[PDB]
Design an enzyme around this catalytic site. Sequence first.
Site, PDB file in Angstrom:
ATOM      1  CD  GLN A   1      -2.282   1.501   2.735  1.00 29.22           C
ATOM      2  OE1 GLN A   1      -1.922   2.497   3.373  1.00 29.22           O
ATOM      3  NE2 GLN A   1      -3.118   0.592   3.233  1.00 29.22           N
TER       4      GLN A   1
ATOM      5  CG  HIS B   1       1.319   7.338   2.533  1.00 22.71           C
ATOM      6  ND1 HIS B   1       2.177   7.667   3.560  1.00 22.71           N
ATOM      7  CD2 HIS B   1       0.365   6.547   3.077  1.00 22.71           C
ATOM      8  CE1 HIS B   1       1.761   7.099   4.678  1.00 22.71           C
ATOM      9  NE2 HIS B   1       0.664   6.414   4.411  1.00 22.71           N
TER      10      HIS B   1
ATOM     11  CD  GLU C   1      -3.556   6.178   4.043  1.00 22.02           C
ATOM     12  OE1 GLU C   1      -2.554   5.434   4.043  1.00 22.02           O
ATOM     13  OE2 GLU C   1      -4.188   6.462   5.083  1.00 22.02           O
TER      14      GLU C   1
ATOM     15  CD  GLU D   1      -4.654   1.723   6.080  1.00 24.02           C
ATOM     16  OE1 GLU D   1      -4.134   2.786   5.676  1.00 24.02           O
ATOM     17  OE2 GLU D   1      -4.137   0.604   5.905  1.00 24.02           O
TER      18      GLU D   1
ATOM     19  CD  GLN E   1      -2.563   2.182   8.539  1.00 20.68           C
ATOM     20  OE1 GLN E   1      -1.871   2.438   7.556  1.00 20.68           O
ATOM     21  NE2 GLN E   1      -3.474   3.027   9.011  1.00 20.68           N
TER      22      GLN E   1
ATOM     23  CG  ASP F   1       2.546   3.682   7.773  1.00 16.55           C
ATOM     24  OD1 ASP F   1       3.280   3.398   8.751  1.00 16.55           O
ATOM     25  OD2 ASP F   1       1.310   3.794   7.890  1.00 16.55           O
TER      26      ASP F   1
ATOM     27  CB  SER G   1      -0.223   0.140   6.157  1.00 15.45           C
ATOM     28  OG  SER G   1       0.411   0.765   7.257  1.00 15.45           O
TER      29      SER G   1
HETATM   30 CA    CA Z   1      -2.061   3.642   5.518  1.00 14.92          CA
END
Ligand code: CA
Lengths: 180, 179, 552, 551, 139, 138
Positions: free
Chosen positions: C141, C143, C170, C221, C296, C335, C362
């Site tokens: 995942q 950003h 995200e 999330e 998460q 992250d 994440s």
């Molecule tokens: Ca995240």
Amino acid sequence: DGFLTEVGEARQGTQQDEVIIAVGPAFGLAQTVNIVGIPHKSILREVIAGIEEEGIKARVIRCFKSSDVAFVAVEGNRLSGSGISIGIQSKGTTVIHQQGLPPLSNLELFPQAPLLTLETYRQIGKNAARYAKRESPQPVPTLNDQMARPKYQAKSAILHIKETKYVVTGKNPQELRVAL
Amino acid sequence: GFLTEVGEARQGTQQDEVIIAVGPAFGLAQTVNIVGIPHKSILREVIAGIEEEGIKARVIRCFKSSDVAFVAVEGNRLSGSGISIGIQSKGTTVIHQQGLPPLSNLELFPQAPLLTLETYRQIGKNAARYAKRESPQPVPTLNDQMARPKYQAKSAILHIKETKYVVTGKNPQELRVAL
Amino acid sequence: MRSKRFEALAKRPVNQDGFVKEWIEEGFIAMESPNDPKPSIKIVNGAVTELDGKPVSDFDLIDHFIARYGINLNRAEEVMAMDSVKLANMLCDPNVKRSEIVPLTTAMTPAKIVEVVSHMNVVEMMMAMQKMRARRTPSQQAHVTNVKDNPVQIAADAAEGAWRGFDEQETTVAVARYAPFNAIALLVGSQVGRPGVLTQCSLEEATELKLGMLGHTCYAETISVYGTEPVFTDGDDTPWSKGFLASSYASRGLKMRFTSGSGSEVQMGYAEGKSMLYLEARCIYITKAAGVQGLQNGSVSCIGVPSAVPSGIRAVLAENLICSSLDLECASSNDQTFTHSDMRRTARLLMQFLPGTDFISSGYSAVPNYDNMFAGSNEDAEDFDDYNVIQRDLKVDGGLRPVREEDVIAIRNKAARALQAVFAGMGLPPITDEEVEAATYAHGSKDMPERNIVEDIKFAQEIINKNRNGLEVVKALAQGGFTDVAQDMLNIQKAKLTGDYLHTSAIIVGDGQVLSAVNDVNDYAGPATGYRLQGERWEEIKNIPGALDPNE
Amino acid sequence: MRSKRFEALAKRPVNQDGFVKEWIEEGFIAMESPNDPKPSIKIVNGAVTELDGKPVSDFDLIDHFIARYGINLNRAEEVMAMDSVKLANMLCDPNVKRSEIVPLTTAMTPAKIVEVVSHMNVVEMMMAMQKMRARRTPSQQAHVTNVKDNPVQIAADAAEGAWRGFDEQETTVAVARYAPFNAIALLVGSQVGRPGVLTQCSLEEATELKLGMLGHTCYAETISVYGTEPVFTDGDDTPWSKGFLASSYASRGLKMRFTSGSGSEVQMGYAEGKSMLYLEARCIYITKAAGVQGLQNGSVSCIGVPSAVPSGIRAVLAENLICSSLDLECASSNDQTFTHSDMRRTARLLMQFLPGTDFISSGYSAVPNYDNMFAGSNEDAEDFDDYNVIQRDLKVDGGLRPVREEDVIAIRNKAARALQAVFAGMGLPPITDEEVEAATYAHGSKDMPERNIVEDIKFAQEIINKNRNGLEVVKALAQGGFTDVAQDMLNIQKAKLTGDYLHTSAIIVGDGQVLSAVNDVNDYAGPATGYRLQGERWEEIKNIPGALDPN
Amino acid sequence: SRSARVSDYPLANKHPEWVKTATNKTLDDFTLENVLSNKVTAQDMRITPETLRLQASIAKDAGRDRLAMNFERAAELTAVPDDRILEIYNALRPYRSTKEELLAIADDLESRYQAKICAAFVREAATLYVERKKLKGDD
Amino acid sequence: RSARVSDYPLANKHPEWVKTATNKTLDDFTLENVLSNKVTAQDMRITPETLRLQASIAKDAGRDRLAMNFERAAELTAVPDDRILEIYNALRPYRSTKEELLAIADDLESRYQAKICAAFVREAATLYVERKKLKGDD
Ligand SMILES: [Ca+2]
Ligand code: B12
Ligand code: B12
Ligand SMILES: [Ca+2]
């Protein structure tokens, strides 16, 4: 083209005031520049000049029994009238050897070919000549770069693999005539 | 002690005002923000930015929570313009507006270490302009990827300390600013 | 007279990091605190009367929620009686199936499972993680943000991210009123990079649910839960409000997971004298109890807290393992920035990267960190090559792949043009051809022309206030010369009708094919079993930039 | 035009590294090569007739040596028949005792064990490594050198290294004739840092043995072995000459291990078309066959070869695993530069650091890399703080500890003064007070005054040619104001009389106490068992600089 | 109702016909053509309680009881309008309601939506909110 | 009688079992005796007795090959340093003729009673012929 010409099997020196430069089996042939592009013609020119400026004769030979720089050099110190020789692989690795020392030992070693310049090569010639005159010269300043292997090891291995193809078992060294 | 309580803060008596709501330790147990800027100087700049816009500034201290969002909310519900600015002792600031969810806002400044006295003045200006129903260019966003690595633990500690001054069920107190 | 050796060390970036000695009273201790409760549980008439030393009479909202919904009571007493060391052994034992563990781990109380994993070293934890991971195939995942909330840049970066391999992307906002634009730009760009990539926009809860109802996101999330009642309160929720929110999302056919992370309670002022891991365990059980499919965690946004203390990074891996051991999808952080040192951030990443998790990170930053609106990620756009190299070095599938500049340029350009058509179609402030080119070749917002922010947020809010839904985006694309993207957009919307991607660890790959823990079961049983990097995927990972043919 | 995103990536350090596509014919493949020999073994009348597909008629010296001395033929056929996947499973299974695995591995052929570990991913390999590691307690080894072969600097850096936790330290030479000076400087400084630290001076074989015979070293590590006959030959040895050399060191009461490492055959031109791991496995078996107790491997000096190809770093971990699995002490490399990237070198280090080996690093550079005469180590002096931080973060014992500047300055100063007294007492070119001072506060040779190299090597050589042994060093210290250091030196020398530290993984800790795999048995049985970081050791690791009390 | 096992998953692949929308539309009804002409609108694109309960059965068969419970609750909430969903969610947030407002919400969910599970969920919260002081005026 | 792992380390459990080539004990080696030359390097040399005790310990620890190595070392303790270097170098590539190697074997056996090492060297001689590593084979 070829600036090196074979003049017959290299034999024991006829005079004491000489230093033998022993080069790998592909030097000046299948390979013509070292690991960082310096011409072999220029390298040999500088090593010889360094030796001669010291009042010592330079005699070049090619070794076939092994591509290992130490054994290329041993091949030469065995025939050198002074007992001193300089081994050079096509990729540039150089060593100043002396008859009587173990094959993997030496007087001076340059383990990182990528860092050598034509100036280093000339200084290597001068020091070798000085060892020939039984003097104790200040060793060529040590060059060391922690990123030399990271950047050049793989290339070095490849270049060596290629020169090694020219190894011929049982074939004695051939003295060479250097063309201007 | 540049902040004196003048009684429980109440609903504004005029529309053209912006409430600056500070944490329970602001100007008290703590006198500088996370990077050493004096609370006195900060409050001075925020007020100046507000007054520059022809808007009145009213300061109050909140006790029900140390969370900057809820400190700011206690302010927007009393503000004559519905607009408020929340500030924690460590410096975190937010421009809030009556009617918005507690954790939402008009503008937010999530990295106190990056705020300068100029930013604080700019924050006061924007708040006043919102009070005047205008739509100001948001204060330029400040973001530093190393702000947390360098200041997060400190931020936590400073907040833990201000949080000891929280008092359940105690309404905000309006404050008189010295000098 | 100073030592030059120490003057050299003093300048090292790691020395700029924040470190502190343990402070038990305020919860500043990662794990194995002498303050944490001893595991225990008493059950009368099928109901819990005691949870980890605390009588039901003293239960806070969290104890109640967990006691009533988070523990498998049928076997709670049985597993409580089992030796925690033997239990930790079972977790990393390659020959004790995951299916044999889950029934037992889900029966453990929060204190019990923390006791279990606390007996493990990081190697054993990783060994166990590769087995407990819900989805057989690991994922990633990213950003996608920028300090200006520039929609054109988001769309382009989202397309590149999707192209590099991210299955979830995200975004978030510098100015909250911009949200609708960020979300739409994220979704459009993601579908252009790879149809099926799921997108989210992290905001205040009510704001995010509303944006989801309007159809501008694929999942949510950052649906927060906290380890202590006071902190949960400042978080503006309770276990019941979040539980209700979870079902609300599902009732709209939207995938969702909760978010937590060690250190949040310390960061927010009330750790109640407990260790970070113990409080995180409560969060994990709140998630289980709510019936939420994934979580998460791994400190996440508050990484500066556990990392400041001893065994903090180890605790982070531990909380991840607890998550998966409880049969929950785990988006394992990695992250957020916590250090100035590359050596240190790499060690923290490998804890999850090596064994593999549902989402190794994440929130890997698909943009340079100065643009990361989550205040910087543990990895960013400039680390893409290093990431691919390490995958190749260790033969580990990190979820990403090497890519060609020409392909990325084309994909970024198409994403920007697609958004340009959307803005034109929906009557939003125009995206000029100059902006399209800028976004195409940009690295970050420093390469983007400034936009009229006041005007953008005005229209962005009209999307919310006038309830302009996702179908308006489909039509704009369809009528603007992007029938293909429009169809991909409609396809992603149709996924919200089947309920298939609502299941544990679900993502969408290939031709709209759901891949979750239900149809991609992890079957680890030691060497040469379970997921193995090989075939075309291995070939793809080998082909990195600079890998020249030696033969010549 | 160009993407700025890609221009940023193009500037990244990792893109300066050397990468190549696999080239099997020349050995440019780390492991799992379709051209590697299928495992196999045939025995007739107690003698091997076939080894991994090769008939005895085609055996080279390596095959002969391994076939005759490196495999337990009593169970070789039995083990050959066992499923490799199952065997790999047993390696990482925390419940299959180390004592149950050694009997099986020592009966496997080189190709067999390679097939086994090749079924594993790095996590499983690390899980197995923590169990197979011979010594219960992990350790560390450091490099102590500088580009000028400056003896004063070596002494000071060695003292600091010992003080930081290294239990073994190694030096080498820019100018071979300097050797005696480097060794003595390393020995003295090390004993000043922590009596018991073992020292070595890596040189040409005959030269090193001779230096060892004079008593200026405690052990030897770079006793090389190679995976192909042509390469072994250019290495100037055979399995038998090295086997003889191994016993020669023991006959003098000196500890020693062999050295090998994936990629050497490629670097030296004759890989005979085999993967790096397979060729390294032959080296590991030569080591076992010779009766040598340990081995320094994990690519080591040729790390630029396996790192250039896919799964090269994984293969490096694999060869370390094979070593330990064969019940051999393993000094697991992490001592040579291969990348420009901090992220990449860290991922390479963690493979051994996380599980722990007999020597996590067989050459962590205790000096800045510009002074590293092994051409740069995977870690150097400037990484000390990062190393201690990661130990703290993961609660992993990396063998080192935080240290106070004041203690280091004092220890370095004492080492320099001690060496000064040695030189004065032995009639060697003087070490001035200015030099003692420089070495005390130096970071590297750049902070050291130039010495007369010609003079130093002249006297360094007289030590060898006149056979000046270690007792002269003791005497010089005892008569120059360093009775204590002299006693420590004598104690380290006395360790060569008992034979205790000649055993697997042996180091000397505390007060002359030998700690080896014999009296510090690794008894791993999963979580909460085996070696566990804790107590005072944990407290020592927790106390890093910059960790203030939040009050 | 009709049960389902893991073998029936994913519904889109195994039983796409089982999936209908709140307005009784089929997956195939959703095409660019129909969207553009508004033959289908956002109102039609809503998951049904039938679909969520089928997934609940599947979650249950996969050994995930609480997840199933969540889907069952979601099934009931499909009937509640978006605005009402947001109102109830906010009502459950700290210090937003009195006990009676919450109890009223529970009665509404039950009598107007047949959301008995959610109704019980809300009444449970109401009782605990009094004990843990999370009702309006408790801050 | 013979050493077992329980007897290890010798230095701690049986210091008296350790004697030097000149029959000196660990305690004889003090700074005083070094400074006055009461003991010299000649006195500081591990004995074949000690090495054989270690070989026995190694064997008891399951390391047979290591024990053999120690057994060879025990035999070599009788060979002078210079001769050790001579024999080592003789075994290196292309250094000797088959005859010279066998000559070394016989000497090892008859002059030093090093039958294990002698057999080791004879074995090398045969294989060196086959693999061509004798002088003149390069
Ligand atoms: Ca995240
Ligand atoms: C990699 C390396 C090795 C590898 C590769 C050697 C090869 N022949 O391919 C291996 C492990 C096999 C090796 C072996 C030895 N090495 Co070495 N090696 C190094 C190292 C760390 C890096 C060199 C490098 O990568 N340069 C970068 C590349 C791009 O440049 P290059 O010019 O192509 O490099 C070549 C030379 O360095 C050469 N080479 C390496 N070692 C030696 C030793 C001698 C005597 C000679 C003549 C050449 C040589 O091999 C390289 C590849 O072809 C250097 C440290 C340093 N300061 O440079 C030591 C170093 C040069 N080696 C040294 C020694 C002593 C040895 C051995 C004699 C040890 C032994 N146990 O026998 C053997 C010699 C083997 C032989 N026949 O050449 C010493 C030299 C001391 C001196 N002043 O004379 C050094 C300085 C330090 C050390 N102890 O490791 N070595
Ligand atoms: C760490 C972090 C968190 C942590 C710590 C917050 C705390 N109260 O202690 C946690 C996980 C709990 C969190 C929660 C939320 N956060 Co937050 N958070 C961050 C992050 C990544 C870093 C901030 C930081 O470490 N700064 C460095 C330190 C040294 O400076 P500081 O001034 O002390 O930092 C404080 C403020 O940032 C504050 N804070 C953090 N989030 C929020 C949100 C709001 C609305 C407010 C008023 C304050 C606030 O907490 C910090 C520590 O005290 C920022 C990203 C960014 N661009 O800064 C997002 C960010 C600020 N958070 C955001 C949001 C939306 C939220 C939530 C509303 C999400 C939710 N699911 O409910 C909640 C609000 C919680 C609350 N009651 O304050 C958005 C704000 C968008 C906007 N423009 O309004 C951002 C930009 C991005 C994101 N989605 O994560 N957050
Ligand atoms: Ca080493």
